[PDB]
Amino acid sequence: ATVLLEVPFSARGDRIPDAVAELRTREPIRKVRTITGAEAWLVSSYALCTQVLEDRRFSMKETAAAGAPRLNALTVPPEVVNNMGNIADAGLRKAVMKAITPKAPGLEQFLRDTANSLLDNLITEGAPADLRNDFADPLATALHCKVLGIPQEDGPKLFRSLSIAFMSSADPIPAAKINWDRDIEYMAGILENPNITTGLMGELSRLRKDPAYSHVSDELFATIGVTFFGAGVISTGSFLTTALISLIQRPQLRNLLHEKPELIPAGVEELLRINLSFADGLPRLATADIQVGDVLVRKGELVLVLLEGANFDPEHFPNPGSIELDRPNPTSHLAHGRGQHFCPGSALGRRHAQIGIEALLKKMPGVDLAVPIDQLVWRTRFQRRIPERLPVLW
C-alpha cells in the first residue's frame, strides 16, 4: 500500500526529475495530493496544459472559494486572487500594462547601470559572491522600485516580505497578514505622496483623482502596488537566479553568449522554456464537468498545470532538455502561462534577464559555481524554487 502521489515532487530547481517524463507518458492527467491533503489533477503534457489554461471554466478566481480543495493556503485576501479581473473591471488594465513595459525611457539604461554597479561591487569585494542575494534579487528589487516610481531605499523592506508572502503552506501564515497589511499601508501612503509622479504608482495616483475612476477603491490601487511589486520581484529574481545556474553549468553556452551577445535574447527564451522556477502547478478550479484527456474532471475539483510538464514535453519541444537557440517554436512555452492569466510582466521579465545576463557575461566572463552544484540549498514549501545562496567565482 502506497499513498496517493504527493506534489510537489522536488524543490530542486537545477534539474527536472526523471519522474515527470514517465508521468507525462503514462498519465498526463493524474490524481495527486497537495500539501493541504486535498486531491487534485496534475496535468503534465503540453497539449493538456494548454487546454486547461485556455479554458476559463478552469477558473483562477474560484480557487479562492471557501471550502475548495486547495493547493496551498491563501497568503492574500481571497478577493485579491482575482486581482487582474479586478484591475480590468476598474478600467485599469491598459494603464497597468503600459506602466510595466521595459520600453519606458531610461529604464533599460537604469537596468544596465544597476547590474553593472552590483557586479563592480562583487568584483571589488572579491570571490566568492552570492549571485542570488547580492545580484539577481537586488536587481529585481531595484527594477521594480523604478517601475513602480517608488524610492529605491524602500525596496529592501518590501523585498523582505516576499520570503513569507510567496510561501506554499498547508495553513494560513500569520506573518503574511502582518506584512500584507503593512505593505498595503505603505502603498496607500505612496498614493498620497505628491513626490510620487512616475511609474505605475505615479500613474495610479493620478488615475485615483481622475473622475473617470472615482468609484474605484483606494484598496484596489494599493493592492495593485503590493501585488505587482511582489509578483515581479519574486518572479524575475527567481527566474534570473535559476537561469544563471543553467548558464554557468553550460560553459560552451556561456562562452557563445559572451562571444555573440546578440544571441542572448534567443538564449533567455530557451532559459525561460527550461526554467523550473515555479515550484507548483498553476492552480485552477473546475466550474463545470470537463473532459481532459482520459479524465472527466468534475465541477469543484482542483487542477494543477505543471509548467515544466508542458515545457519539457518532447512532442512539442524535441530534445526538451537541450538549449537550442534556433527552435521553430521558441516563445510557444508556458513559462509565462497562457490564456486569460498570461503574465502581464512577460516583456519586463524577459528584459531583466537579458540585461542581467549581458552585464554578468561582460563583467564576469569566467563565472563558475564556487561550490559543487549539489551543495546549493533549495528553498522548500515556497511558490518558487530557488537556491538560498548562489556562490560563484570568476
Q: Is 84 annotated as a binding residue?
A: yes
The piece of 162-170, 204-212, 313-321, 343-351 that touches ligand HEM (CB under 6 A) is 343-351
* Residue 321 or 365 having the CB closest to its own copies: 365
Side chain identity at residue 97, one-letter code: M
Interface with ligand HEM, residue 282, by CB under 6 A = yes
**Residue choice 102, 149, 232, 237 for contact with ligand HEM (CB under 6 A):** 232
Query: Which residues, including other chains, have CB under 8 Å from residue 118's CB and lie 6 or more apart?
Result: 134, 135, 138, 139
From residue 229, alpha-carbon distances to 96, 165, 191 in Å are: 12, 11, 15
Partner from its own copies, ligand HEM, none binding residue 235, C-beta < 5-8 Å depending on class: ligand HEM
Cβ at position 105, least distance to its own copies in Å: 37
Q: Which residues bind its own copies (CB under 8 A)?
A: 126-128, 163-164, 167, 169-171, 173-175, 178-179, 182, 370-372, 374-375, 377-382, 388-389, 391, 393
Interface with ligand HEM, residue 345, by CB under 6 A = yes
* Residue 293 or 391 having the CB closest to its own copies: 391
Tell the residue number behind the cell numbers 497597468, with chain if given.
96
Task: Encode burial over 13-48: b for 16+ CB neighbours within 10 A, e otherwise.
Answer: bbebeeebbebbeebbbbebbbbbebebbbbbbbeb
Alpha helices of the chain — where are they, by DSSP H? Answer: 18-26, 46-53, 83-89, 93-99, 107-125, 137-148, 155-160, 162-165, 174-191, 199-207, 218-248, 251-259, 264-273, 307-311, 346-363
Partner from its own copies, ligand HEM, none binding residue 293, C-beta < 5-8 Å depending on class: none
Side chain identity at residue 266, one-letter code: A
DSSP string, 105-142: TTHHHHHHHHHHHHHHHHHHH-S-EETIIIIIHHHHHH
Partner from ligand HEM, its own copies, none binding residue 110, C-beta < 5-8 Å depending on class: none
Cβ at position 368, least distance to its own copies in Å: 8
Q: Is 75 annotated as a binding residue?
A: yes
Tell the residue number behind the cell numbers 468534475, with chain if given.
298
Partner from ligand HEM, its own copies, none binding residue 354, C-beta < 5-8 Å depending on class: none
Side chain identity at residue 113, one-letter code: D
Partner from ligand HEM, its own copies, none binding residue 378, C-beta < 5-8 Å depending on class: its own copies
* Residue 294 or 368 having the CB closest to its own copies: 368
CB-based burial label for 321 (10 Å; 0-12, 13-18, 19+): exposed
d(CA 50, CA 376): 32
Interface with ligand HEM, residue 385, by CB under 6 A = no
Interface with ligand HEM, residue 60, by CB under 6 A = yes
Q: How many residues sit close enough to ligand HEM to count as binding (CB under 6 A)?
A: 21
The piece of 69-77, 258-266, 342-350, 377-385 that touches ligand HEM (CB under 6 A) is 342-350
Residues that constitute the known binding site: 75, 83-84, 235, 284, 299, 341, 343, 383
Q: Give the residues lining the site for ligand HEM (CB under 6 A).
A: 60, 84, 100, 227-228, 231-232, 235-236, 239, 277, 282, 335-337, 341, 343-345, 348-349
